[PDB]
Amino acid sequence: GPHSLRYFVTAVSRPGLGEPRYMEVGYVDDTEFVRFDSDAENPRYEPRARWMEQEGPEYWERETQKAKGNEQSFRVDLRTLLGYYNQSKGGSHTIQVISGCEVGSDGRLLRGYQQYAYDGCDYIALNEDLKTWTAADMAALITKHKWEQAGEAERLRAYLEGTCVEWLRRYLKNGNATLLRTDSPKAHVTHHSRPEDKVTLRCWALGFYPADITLTWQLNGEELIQDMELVETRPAGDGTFQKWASVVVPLGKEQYYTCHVYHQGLPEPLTLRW
């Protein structure tokens, strides 16, 4: 199936409390695999996935040097944006970036992307054509021009189509046992009483990987999507995810409702009842 290499970057200024905090967190699909935190006792790029032990010392030194270079670059960016927006030096501000590429099952690039945000709002983004930028405001229009004159889009395209793709393939290979596995979810239903002769039936799905899953409740064969409670799929601390979906039904009518779980680790979907 498709796979992706994504980096979530954050730069937050802490006026009065010293230098801003800088963080890089990398992901291959739903798995965190590398991280850098400027607040760390010893700021170094560190592995977050066991399979990353296959990379030599030179890998960690290079990535650490780049991250520190990025830290300095974003320190300046925070100052620059105060100018663009005419903001005072005393406030805390945030720059967020999501950068990455995705390859199909055969390892060829499907798409590459890069998007910036300032204080929680879109700032500038690379367009699907990987050649042009789109600014969310006049400030971003300043950056757009700078980048066009520096030929930045070409440099980024080189990375997205090259480095990003090749390293993504490499990570998928070295960590294939972890990244290409499939953990089948284990599901169960809980019952909770409520006032006015009604009950809450909750359908739980635990220990699955990849994170993609579909949990639905049905009555008369119709899926009750509109009348359904649900949490976003969440990591459970060991590389797997969980999710639950609930429905409040009339007391004594619980047996007319079934929970269905669809996941790639299930040849046939699970059907549960209380």
Binding site: Y7, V34, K66, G69, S73, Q114, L156
Partner: peptide, 8 residues
């Protein structure tokens, strides 16, 4: 492998 970002 991360990218070396350009300044804004």
């Amino acid at each position: 492998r991360g990218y070396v970002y350009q300044g804004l």
